[PDB]
Design an enzyme around this catalytic site. Structure first.
Site, PDB file in Angstrom:
ATOM      1  N   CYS A 107       0.831  -1.205   0.000  1.00 15.64           N
ATOM      2  CA  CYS A 107       0.000   0.000   0.000  1.00 15.64           C
ATOM      3  C   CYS A 107       0.872   1.264   0.000  1.00 15.64           C
ATOM      4  CB  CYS A 107      -0.966  -0.012   1.204  1.00 15.64           C
ATOM      5  SG  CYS A 107      -1.876   1.541   1.395  1.00 15.64           S
ATOM      6  N   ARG A 110       0.028   4.581   2.722  1.00 12.88           N
ATOM      7  CA  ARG A 110       0.188   4.499   4.188  1.00 12.88           C
ATOM      8  C   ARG A 110       0.498   5.756   4.992  1.00 12.88           C
ATOM      9  NH1 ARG A 110       4.034  -0.439   4.777  1.00 12.88           N
ATOM     10  NH2 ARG A 110       4.502  -0.145   2.542  1.00 12.88           N
ATOM     11  N   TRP A 279      -9.166   6.164  -0.898  1.00  9.10           N
ATOM     12  CA  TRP A 279      -9.489   6.847  -2.159  1.00  9.10           C
ATOM     13  C   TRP A 279      -8.536   6.316  -3.235  1.00  9.10           C
ATOM     14  CZ3 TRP A 279      -8.397   9.896   2.300  1.00  9.10           C
ATOM     15  CH2 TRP A 279      -7.045  10.376   2.398  1.00  9.10           C
ATOM     16  N   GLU A 284      -4.560   3.471 -10.960  1.00  9.77           N
ATOM     17  CA  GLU A 284      -5.330   2.233 -10.761  1.00  9.77           C
ATOM     18  C   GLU A 284      -6.422   2.123 -11.801  1.00  9.77           C
ATOM     19  OE1 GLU A 284      -6.136   1.082  -6.480  1.00  9.77           O
ATOM     20  OE2 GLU A 284      -5.552   3.198  -6.203  1.00  9.77           O
TER      21      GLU A 284
END
Ligand code: HEM
Ligand code: HEM
Ligand SMILES: Cc1cc(N)nc(CCc2cc(N)cc(CCc3cc(C)cc(N)n3)c2)c1
Ligand SMILES: Cc1cc(N)nc(CCc2cc(N)cc(CCc3cc(C)cc(N)n3)c2)c1
Ligand SMILES: C[C@H](O)[C@H](O)[C@H]1CNc2nc(N)[nH]c(=O)c2N1
Ligand SMILES: C[C@H](O)[C@H](O)[C@H]1CNc2nc(N)[nH]c(=O)c2N1
Ligand SMILES: [Zn+2]
EC number: 1.14.13.39
Lengths: 403, 404
Positions: A107, A110, A279, A284
């Site tokens: 991720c 973070r 969000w 992506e």
């Protein structure tokens, strides 16, 4: 023993000492590295994970060794010994969910780890109740386009019974309908879930962006179907700041990325349904969801619209089209006032996160392949940063599909 | 399933199992506890054992495994080591070993070409002047007026208590980087150190952005000697853009021939400290890394300004737009000049072909995912969606410490 970690743009060095806290093995051995693989191929152990975790929690509120700490360790010991398991206090759950996010090597987001709304849904006893909680989650997290990170935690796995599960991989997903001639209409990644929804009685649509129902499962029961009310699902029509034909592609995406198939592990306990949402980072949608060849696969269509030379790779038509699509995503989210972050902004903030964690904990587990964005990798600071990957607990884990 | 890593391609849904990794005799840096795959950097009878293994590999590759010639060569190697401490490769063993070191290189996307490598034998070389002659011939052959040909030149191997042959330059062709009065660098910042070493050894420095460096060549137990490459031997490509007319005005250029000169070639425990090898470029190496890295030429901002992008906000994607145009300029200009180059789409397609070749030929292919995936448009190439097993096989090319 402690890895030297270098940044190659800046020449700076750190040492990762946090990795010594890892108690679970990853996939690599000294003979071979498997860091690019997506997936992995008694009471006294639960007790020692539980003690560790409670120790982590009292240390976090700066109360290690205190009365409250000692009595909580006893409560946990007494409960496991009598029952084979135990239960978390709400605040411990809150802290554990933040830690699992903080600990997630894949991720890039973070820096936000401290800002997470935790819904305790552990008093859920039916798929119906799960549905209400999930709608509340979505309403909260969406916040009219001003997105807020959240997690809803349904009841833990228990020895004697089946799991609470959300069958969908994300709360919001578009149908993939397999056609006569083996082409797909909609999202090819969701063919199988679309088919599961239909066979459990969903009347399907026939468009490219049909939002799927949820399949929710209470322990040892058939999953149940719930249509999400259209007003809860915020979407953003895609258009381009200067390319006017682009809006005519009819392209759209949903505001809310919410993962619902992962297992949350805290202090030895396992939460098989604990959907969480933040969000989007624009790549992506712009790069993976829209341009992957096994996804919406729109690259060629866009390039032709742009009148590019499609016959030779060396014109970099694919690169040129991908940039414009990522630009359309960013512009469109900005225009609709829906939280999004671009890959340059996200990666700069991840570097800051790396520095914060270095000072806080002596390291940060990160999976370079997942942190580096899928376009323009070396144009981001993270490309140039060495990273150490390892498993800390609390953790989000993969688990088998329920069917 | 099979007791070997399972490897998946997520675009195509296909599965393979890597059995080749079982033949790795050397540990990388990872453990079950942590993955260190993103990090750039990591003999009595130990030699005999490495030599035996290499000879077994050679005899397999010609299909004479277990034969009388195979056993006699084995015996010949142990006897040579038994009496001198080292041994020596036959010509055809060197050729095989050099091609196999390339084949085995986990970081190289060009491996589809591995069987096609001109091996120059320079194991008779005895001076720095002769190294220079050898290197100049390599450059002429390899460059071939723009129609590039992969080649390696191999100098004498490391010997018992006797100095190494070393090329001090990390590449045969590199641009100077001159540390300026204001802390900044003119030229290539990667090369400030070697540039200052060249001056220290008596080079009269230029003051341009693209001055080709001289070679510092070191024969055994001698100070390195300085050699200026004759300019007609170093093919360069001035950079222009196909539609952006002003791009030519920027005066950028790059050299045609990528040739690594600082790596160690290990074959059967023998160590070739000077063994420069070269190929042709993948266009991203120049237009993305060399031209756009912040710690390299760093031209992204300048190009974005010329293109009139909004450089004040990340979300205009000005960096992405400028980088695409720079990569296109590199491809276009190499094409116009007729100098072999491969773009990152064609390269990565060809590497997937290579993977499928090696699955059949050897049961796997060591590949370093983070190096194989190109630095722009990563997931637009097929290699992004392909899982990879990384491991060290020998013969190998390895890093070695700088001679200074
Ligand atoms: C706040 C904004 C956030 C951003 C911009 C963000 C960013 C991302 C991105 C880009 C990925 C890669 C996704 C992919 O390639 O499939 C990812 C993965 C992941 N993130 Fe985040 N994140 C955010 C919030 C969160 C939150 C709230 C959590 C959990 C509480 C979370 C946990 C995870 C996990 C567990 C993964 C790995 C998913 C997997 O293995 O499939 N992130 N993050
Ligand atoms: C035929 C054309 C070739 C192409 C297109 C090619 C491509 C590349 C590329 C793009 C890299 C990444 C380098 C970087 O980013 O620094 C690389 C690395 C490498 N290649 Fe190739 N290659 C070719 C020929 C060769 C040859 C002839 C050899 C040796 C005989 C070779 C061996 C290597 C090695 C050892 C590395 C790793 C260098 C390092 O770790 O620093 N390649 N290759
Ligand atoms: C086979 C397989 C299994 C499995 N479990 N996961 C994957 C890929 C993971 C993944 C895939 C997609 N499409 C979306 C996300 C949301 C990513 C995300 C989450 C959050 C919270 C914020 C954000 N921006 N993005 C994650 C593949
Ligand atoms: C200074 C330094 C030292 C060291 N130990 N490692 C590196 C990184 C490797 C590397 C760096 C650069 N700039 C260029 C190449 C040529 C790569 C290449 C080679 C061939 C033969 C063909 C091709 N296309 N590209 C390789 C740099
Ligand atoms: C094979 C490879 O590990 C796989 O394609 C990974 C690469 N990096 C990724 N990175 C992110 N953020 N998400 C992904 O799905 C992937 N896919
Ligand atoms: C930190 C990371 O290991 C490093 O920057 C790597 C990433 N991938 C790379 N890939 C290639 N081909 N060349 C490189 O120099 C690098 N750099
Ligand atoms: Zn590893």
């Amino acid at each position: 023993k402690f890895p030297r970690v270098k940044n190659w743009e800046l020449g700076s060095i750190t040492y990762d000492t946090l990795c010594a806290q890892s108690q679970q093995d990853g996939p690599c051995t000294p003979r071979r590295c498997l860091g690019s693989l997506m997936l992995p191929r008694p009471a006294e152990q639960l007790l020692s994970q539980a003690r560790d975790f409670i120790n982590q929690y009292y240390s976090s509120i700066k109360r290690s060794g205190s009365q409250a700490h000692e009595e909580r360790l006893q409560e946990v010991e007494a409960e496991v010994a009598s029952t084979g398991t135990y239960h978390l206090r709400e605040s411990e759950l809150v802290f554990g969910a933040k830690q699992a996010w903080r600990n997630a090597p894949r991720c890039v987001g973070r820096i936000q780890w401290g800002k997470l709304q935790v819904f305790d849904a552990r008093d859920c006893s039916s798929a119906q109740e799960m549905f209400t909680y999930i709608c509340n989650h979505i309403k909260y997290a969406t916040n009219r386009g001003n997105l807020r990170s959240a997690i809803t935690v349904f009841p833990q796995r228990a020895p004697g019974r089946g799991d609470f599960r959300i069958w969908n991989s994300q709360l919001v997903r578009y149908a993939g309908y397999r056609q006569q001639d083996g082409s797909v209409r909609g999202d090819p990644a969701n063919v199988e879930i679309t088919e599961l929804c239909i066979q459990h009685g969903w009347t399907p649509g026939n468009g490219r962006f049909d939002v799927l129902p949820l399949l929710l499962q209470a322990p040892d029961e058939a999953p149940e179907l719930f249509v999400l009310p259209p007003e809860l699902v915020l979407e953003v029509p895609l258009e381009h700041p200067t390319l006017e034909w682009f809006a005519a592609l009819g392209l759209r995406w949903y505001a809310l990325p919410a993962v619902s198939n992962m297992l949350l592990e805290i202090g030895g306990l396992e939460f098989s349904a604990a959907p969480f949402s933040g969000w989007y980072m624009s790549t992506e949608i712009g790069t993976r969801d829209l341009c992957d060849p096994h996804r919406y696969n729109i690259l060629e269509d866009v390039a032709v619209c742009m009148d590019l030379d499609t016959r030779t790779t060396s014109s970099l038509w694919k690169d040129k089209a991908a940039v414009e699509i990522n630009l359309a995503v960013l512009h469109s989210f900005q225009l609709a006032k829906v939280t999004i972050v671009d890959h340059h902004a996200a990666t700069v903030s991840f570097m800051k996160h790396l520095d914060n964690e270095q000072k806080a904990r002596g390291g940060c587990p990160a999976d370079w392949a997942w942190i580096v964005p899928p376009i323009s990798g070396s144009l981001t600071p993270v490309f140039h940063q060495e990273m150490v990957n390892y498993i800390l607990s609390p953790a989000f884990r993969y688990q088998p599909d329920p069917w």
